[PDB]
Amino acid sequence: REIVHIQAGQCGNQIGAKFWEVISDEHGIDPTGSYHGDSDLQLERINVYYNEAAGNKYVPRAILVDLEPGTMDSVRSGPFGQIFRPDNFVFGQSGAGNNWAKGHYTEGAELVDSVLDVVRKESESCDCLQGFQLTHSLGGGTGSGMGTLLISKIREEYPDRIMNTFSVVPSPKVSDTVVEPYNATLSVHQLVENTDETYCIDNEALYDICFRTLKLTTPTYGDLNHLVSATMSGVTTCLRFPGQLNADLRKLAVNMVPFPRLHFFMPGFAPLTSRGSQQYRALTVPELTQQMFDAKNMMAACDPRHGRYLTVAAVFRGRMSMKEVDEQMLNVQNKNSSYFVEWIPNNVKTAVCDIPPRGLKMSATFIGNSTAIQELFKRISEQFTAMFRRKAFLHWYTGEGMDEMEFTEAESNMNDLVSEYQQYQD
């Protein structure tokens, strides 16, 4: 098939931008220009991620959405700014948000159509559609509330085609607001119901990796982001690249999720961090795997251990041998055989690809549907359950025009999800 991409909400935006510019120079694209890497591969599938307009140029099938100017003009002036087509930007003008309510109801619906329509003109343009990947922030409004609407309006116009997100679930540590739970728990309700798959990048791991295991004292929003970026490269790999599989996202659903309740994957990466070393290269492949299936190395605040694995997909990248890899992978599912659902016979498949990411001559990455993920939900609920208790900051949405019962009804959707994951440790 072939996919298009929605990138909404200040975070979701930087995430996608720092994404776009990492993958773009994997395939050898200049700020506008075309190819500049006399290595051949790259382009077979450049397909899936780039509609290509006049002359050379390559232009990503990407749509930019926000409810305040600023954060787009940070991509426009900056990185690979000159890449995205101009009528593909959808600036909101408007009040920011930073309350779901704003972006899902008031200033939300305000835009919807303007965006909903440019999305149509790009997906109707594309040859046979796959689905959409949207990148957004699960806490705080524009893209927690907008994006969750967006989907609940995509799905509906596109019920055949499938639904993907990278959601950044917020922390108490380098988060901004003490409304976050409200926003996450409101989106997270929406999420569960209309994505066929979602990746959770929890900022908590994202911080924890940055300082607790990467020397870095004051974690930038950048020296932090480059993480998620690099993860996202290595998660999409297969649908971007060679001959082996190619992965219809569909294929990556009905292979990753046993259960309708879209079960969100924690990702995990291989070797990591900023610039100032650990390009040792000597990341032997035992050494790669070991570091990949690690608690202190997952993309969500979660240590598999306290949760068995449902199904798992891991892809390697570089110049090595499935000779060692297929061998190595197996000594994991034994020296770990216990936590790994036996009732799903082959729950772990493994791919190789000859073209490295970033620096790295050897680099893998990991997609993981594990009951372990519940840990993370139970936590947002924990802050929420304790806040909405004596109805704390709430009167802040009551006002943008929501119902009291709507929180509980989203709360005990969550509080179910938990109690289903926990149920599948059977």
Partner: protein
């Protein structure tokens, strides 16, 4: 000893040496039978009732055979009948399983589409609840 001369001819002569006479007063009666079968042209009709048996055997084992013959015609027929008769079944239970498919997904669809439609007569009927607090 004596002979007894019986005829004399152009080209022969006969006689009899009777040698010692028999031991006689006439005697026997050995199938010199008092009811003994002078026979009859009417028993051509004995030649017939034997040939009405042949005409039989032939006609009733050409019967015990057009009998066989016309079972054959009905076996090769119960096989145009066996076949014809299973096309008409797993040919039709094919499309029957296919109305059960376009029909069932017609549901799990426009009933998935159903949820995401009063999620919407709620966005807009509690934005006309924007007119409430303010």
């Amino acid at each position: 000893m004596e002979v007894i001369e019986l005829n004399k001819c152009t080209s022969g002569q006969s006689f009899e040496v009777i040698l010692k006479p028999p031991s006689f007063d006439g005697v026997p009666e050995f199938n010199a039978s008092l009811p003994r079968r002078p026979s009859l042209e009417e028993i051509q009709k004995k030649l017939e009732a034997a040939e009405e048996r042949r005409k039989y055997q032939e006609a009733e084992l050409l019967k015990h055979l057009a009998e066989k013959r016309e079972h054959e015609r009905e076996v090769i027929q119960k096989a145009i009948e066996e076949n014809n008769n299973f096309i008409k079944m797993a040919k039709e239970k094919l499309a029957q399983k296919m109305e059960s498919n376009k029909e069932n997904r017609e549901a799990h669809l426009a009933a998935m589409l159903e949820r995401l439609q009063e999620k919407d007569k709620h966005a807009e009927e509690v934005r006309k609840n924007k007119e409430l607090k303010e």
